[PDB]
Copies of this chain bind each other. A is one copy, B any other.
Amino acid sequence: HTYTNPVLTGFHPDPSIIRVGEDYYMVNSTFQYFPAIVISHSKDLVHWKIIGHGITENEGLDLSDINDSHGIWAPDISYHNGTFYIFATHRLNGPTVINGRKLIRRQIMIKSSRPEGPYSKPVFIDEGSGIDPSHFVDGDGKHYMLLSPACTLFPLNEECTDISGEPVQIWEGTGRRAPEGPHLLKKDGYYYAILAEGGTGYSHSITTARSTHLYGPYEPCPYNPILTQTDPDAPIQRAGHGKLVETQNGEWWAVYLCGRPNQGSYTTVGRETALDPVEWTDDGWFVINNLKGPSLVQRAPNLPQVKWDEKNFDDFDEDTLGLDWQFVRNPDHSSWSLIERPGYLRLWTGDWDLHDIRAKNTVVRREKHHLYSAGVKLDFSPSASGEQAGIVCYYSTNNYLKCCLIYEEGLKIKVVENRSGCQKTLGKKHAEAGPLFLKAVINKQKRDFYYSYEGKHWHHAGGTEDASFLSDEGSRDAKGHTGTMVGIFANNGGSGRKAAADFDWFRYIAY
């Protein structure tokens, strides 16, 4: 067959991939979202499903105070001698001292005998000089950590628990700001160093070097940049941060991150993971997509195609929270449940609105399309001012768009946008009592909400004609590194009473 990029749509930055046997595994940055480090599985490199996460509170890292687009980012997954290694960076809210150590970020090492975990408790490697750690072992079994700026090589104990001395930069890069995303690869004696250069913005690219020996000297590639988007009209932009993988059939493919401009320079869905083949030259270099840049349509890998259960309808009947959901920061396990009313996902109304960092139990899944629908059946009965629950299209504390059943001098269905820190009520209609149907209709940059009492007749509650603020660039946040999510929420305002909001099902329709 053929496939269309990106293969893993939705909020999926900083891809990293390994092949073990017939299986392929991917990790993506998650920032303030919990659980941390989303782990995905594929058999054909085209169709991916989420299979778990790296840090799941059993190994207790806490994000309840982490700022937007801070926290766990840029993971690398690797496999050596029956152990899966995930190295990642925890970006701090700001300068923080840990052992006479002015640090703004820390490296994390978790490991497990299985790709989906449970991984070990995060071991910190407090080397705050760079970002995008990647794991590399050499033919002699010595473990190394690559960090930015460019390729700085860190030896590791066996162990991978701490640096065993001497940092050294094996490749400086070409030029261009933010030489990062370092990756090494040993192929036929040579050591291939991979970089991301130009910044994660629209000048993003992939540049590589090569050396006979691990510690250099490395010569630049004559095809640099081996991957970039030079066509500003192409629907896929900001291509970079790649990693190579070789299939069981001898093919070579590269996953990388990319953005889909949504009617302008707005990556509403966030950075996604794209796919493209790797072709080897006769002078010992590799190139992505024959230097043609990101492909829109592409010959699919020579692997048996395996498509997954999308799980776009969640009836909340299984005892386990489905792996496509994410919590904004750590859950409040006292105020959410799938067991207090089986068949329903119960959210007790928290004490904080979505614009606060302390809001809890916002449950959201990724938007994978610019044209989609999101629906919910809700059993909710707000009794006092401020008590509310419903659907939200969420980017960050300063940028969301919510629709909720609320008590505000009687039952009301209310549409509220938070646009770059500015709250505005887009609509408010009288609400009758009883189970309620809410539908979020997303049409490119136009997004509206509809309420219903039987799922058959819909009424417009309110909407916006400009949802550009639900994007990386439109959010105007100091760091727009995530992506817009759609999901459910509940808070009291307001009146610190625990009112139960029972969501019978969630429904996602790409139309």
Could you tell me the distance in whole angstroms from the C-beta of A268 to the nearest C-beta in chain B?
Answer: 13
Q: A450 — nearest CB in chain B belongs to which residue?
A: B371
Bound complex: CA A444 to CA B449 (Å)? 12
Segment touching B, from A246-254, A455-463, A471-479, A481-489? A455-463
| A297: chain B residues within 8 A (beta carbon) | 453-454
| A456: chain B residues within 8 A (beta carbon) | 4-5, 235, 296
For residue A443, CB closer than 8 A to chain B, the reply is yes
Partner of A443, one of B260, B263, B443, B454: B443
Could you tell me the distance in whole angstroms from the C-beta of A403 to the nearest C-beta in chain B?
Answer: 15
In the complex with contacts A371-B450, A509-B511, A511-B373, A444-B460 CB distance below 8 A: yes
Could you tell me the distance in whole angstroms from the C-beta of A284 to the nearest C-beta in chain B?
Answer: 34
| A454: chain B residues within 8 A (beta carbon) | 4, 296-297
Could you tell me the distance in whole angstroms from the C-beta of A274 to the nearest C-beta in chain B?
Answer: 11
A141-157: CB near B (< 8 Å → 1, else 0) gives 00000000000000000
Could you tell me the distance in whole angstroms from the C-beta of A181 to the nearest C-beta in chain B?
Answer: 25
A408-446: CB near B (< 8 Å → 1, else 0) gives 000000000000000000000000000000010101100
| A457: chain B residues within 8 A (beta carbon) | 235-236, 260, 296
For residue A365, CB closer than 8 A to chain B, the reply is no
Contact B511 A441 (CB under 8 A): yes
For residue A370, CB closer than 8 A to chain B, the reply is yes
| A443: chain B residues within 8 A (beta carbon) | 441, 443, 448
Could you tell me the distance in whole angstroms from the C-beta of A453 to the nearest C-beta in chain B?
Answer: 7
Contact B441 A296 (CB under 8 A): no
A333-391 interface with B by 8 A CB criterion? 370-373
**Most chain B C-beta atoms within 10 Å of own C-beta, residue among A370, A450, A453, A456:** A456
Bound complex: CA A466 to CA B199 (Å)? 44
Bound complex: CA A386 to CA B439 (Å)? 40
In the complex with contacts A441-B443, A444-B460, A448-B443, A296-B373 CB distance below 8 A: no
Partner of A511, one of B235, B236, B511: B511
Partner of A296, one of B453, B458, B460: B453
Could you tell me the distance in whole angstroms from the C-beta of A310 to the nearest C-beta in chain B?
Answer: 14
Could you tell me the distance in whole angstroms from the C-beta of A312 to the nearest C-beta in chain B?
Answer: 11
Bound complex: CA A450 to CA B510 (Å)? 14
Could you tell me the distance in whole angstroms from the C-beta of A393 to the nearest C-beta in chain B?
Answer: 15
A41-70: CB near B (< 8 Å → 1, else 0) gives 000000000000000000000000000000
Could you tell me the distance in whole angstroms from the C-beta of A47 to the nearest C-beta in chain B?
Answer: 14
Contact B441 A371 (CB under 8 A): yes
In the complex with contacts A371-B441, A443-B448, A460-B444, A455-B4 CB distance below 8 A: yes
Could you tell me the distance in whole angstroms from the C-beta of A424 to the nearest C-beta in chain B?
Answer: 22
Could you tell me the distance in whole angstroms from the C-beta of A60 to the nearest C-beta in chain B?
Answer: 40
Bound complex: CA A236 to CA B457 (Å)? 9
| A371: chain B residues within 8 A (beta carbon) | 373, 439, 441, 450, 458
Could you tell me the distance in whole angstroms from the C-beta of A339 to the nearest C-beta in chain B?
Answer: 26
| A441: chain B residues within 8 A (beta carbon) | 371, 443, 511
Q: A442 — nearest CB in chain B belongs to which residue?
A: B511
| A511: chain B residues within 8 A (beta carbon) | 372-373, 441, 509, 511
Contact A458 B373 (CB under 8 A): no
Q: A459 — nearest CB in chain B belongs to which residue?
A: B235
A246-283: CB near B (< 8 Å → 1, else 0) gives 00000000000000100100000000000000000000
Q: List 16 A-B contacts (CB under 8 A).
A: A4-B456, A235-B457, A236-B457, A260-B457, A263-B460, A296-B456, A297-B453, A371-B373, A371-B439, A371-B450, A371-B458, A372-B511, A443-B448, A444-B458, A509-B511, A511-B511
15 new A-B contacts, CB < 8 A, other than A235-B456, A235-B457, A297-B454, are A4-B454, A236-B457, A260-B457, A296-B453, A296-B454, A297-B453, A371-B373, A371-B439, A371-B450, A373-B511, A443-B443, A443-B448, A509-B509, A509-B511, A511-B511
A residues bordering B, Cβ < 8 Å?
4-5, 235-236, 260, 263, 296-297, 370-373, 439, 441, 443-444, 448, 450, 453-458, 460, 509, 511
